[model samples]
Each structure stands twice: as C-alpha cells, then as structure tokens.
Target: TTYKLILNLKQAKEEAIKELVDAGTAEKYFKLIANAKTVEGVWTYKDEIKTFTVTE
Candidate 1:
C-alpha cells in the first residue's frame, strides 16, 4: 500500500542517517537532513526511535 511504502522510505532514510552518524559524520548534519525530510514535521536526534505505520 502507499502508506506502507511511505513508512518504509522513512525508515530507510532514518537508518541511512544513523549509519552515517555512527560512522563519525556530525550529529548536527544528520539531524538537519532528517528534519528536512521528516514526514512527521519534527526534528529528531540521531538516536531517537519513532513509531511507523505498517500495512499488510
């Protein structure tokens, strides 16, 4: 479903950002990118966990 795809995309983006941060990219930059693209309209730290909608 479209909603599922959206959630998956969000998750994938978050994971990619986290990996970059863990690998020593600046946390501020990760937060910047995530906030810019977030569907929830909230800026988040690299370590924050979010609930996502999923459909079968």
Candidate 2:
C-alpha cells in the first residue's frame, strides 16, 4: 500500500523538522531535508511555488 504526504515550506525549517520528528521516523525526515535542493533546475515540481510571510 502507498500513502500521500504533504508539508508547507512556509513554516520554519526547525518547526517543520520538529513536526516530522514528533510524527516518528526522524531519520527519514532528516534524509529528505538533506537531499533537498533549493537552487533552480536541481529539482522540479509541476505546481507553482508558494510563499508565506512570518509576522511577530
């Protein structure tokens, strides 16, 4: 069986990491983050990029 997973990049990296860690499989989460590429052309996605602001 397979499942779909989603996350919002708008959240802080630490926060996102924490959430993933709390959900278990911390090693997998870190591996995903480590392999991520922010530079254009390094990774491709069909959807338009989304951005969010953080206010104090």
Candidate 3:
C-alpha cells in the first residue's frame, strides 16, 4: 500500500535546511534559501504545495 502526505511550507523549509546542514554540505547550495521558492519550486507563490509518498 501507499500513502500520500502534504506539509506546510515553513516546516518543509526548516526540515530542508536541517537536513542540508546536517549533511555538512550546505555551502554550495546555501544561496537556495535566499530564493527558496525557486529552489523548492513546487508551486505558485500564493499557494504552496509540498507532497510526500509513504510505502510499507
């Protein structure tokens, strides 16, 4: 089976940053944060859409 999940933009951003930093390789892509919407680039500015897939 599979499951679908959606997330808040802010939370997704925080998690993204955390993972990026934890990997000790945030240097190259750090600028992405300044243009987050472009980096993540999922949807329009007004309404954001982030999705996840889960399987078991």
Candidate 4:
C-alpha cells in the first residue's frame, strides 16, 4: 500500500530545497519563502512538482 501526504507552502518549499539539490533552481527556490502565496489554505505551487522512487 502507498500513502499520500500533504504539506503547507513553506513546508513544501523547504522540502523542495533539500529534494531539488544540486540544481540551478535550488538557490532560487529558497527565495520562495519571501514570495509565497500565504492564503491561509492548503495549496500547492506550479513548480512544486517532485519526483522520486521508493528504494528499499
């Protein structure tokens, strides 16, 4: 079975910085904190798509 989790904008962005490491956009992505969509709701951004595979 698989589990899907959700995170807030800031929390998600912070995760992206760590997940999208070694990329030109990583440095820029860190600035997402300064310019984020804080609408007091659970939401995601266009560039917040992440890819990964489970390895055991």
Best candidate according to TM-score = 1
lDDT for each residue of candidate 1 in 1-56, tens digit (9 for 90 to 100): 11111222443644441323232344444445544555564332222342222211
Cα deviation in Å at residue 38, candidate 2? 8.2
Winner on lDDT (3 vs 4)? 4
TM-score of 1: 0.32
| Model 4 spans with C-alpha error above 4 angstroms | 1-17, 34-56
lDDT of each: 0.34, 0.30, 0.31, 0.35
lDDT of 3 by residue, 1-56 (tens): 11123324553432232223232243334334434433343432211232231111
lDDT of 4 by residue, 9-49 (tens): 44443233244544345434443442343334434433345
Candidates sorted by TM-score, best first = 1, 2, 4, 3
Q: Between the candidate structures 1 and 4, which one is better when assessed by TM-score?
A: 1
The TM-scores of all predictions, comma-separated, are 0.32, 0.24, 0.17, 0.22
Off by over 4 Å in 3: 1-14, 17-24, 38-56
Which residue pairs in candidate 1 have backbone atoms (N, alpha carbon, C) closer than 3 angstroms, thus clashing? Answer: none
TM-score of 4: 0.22
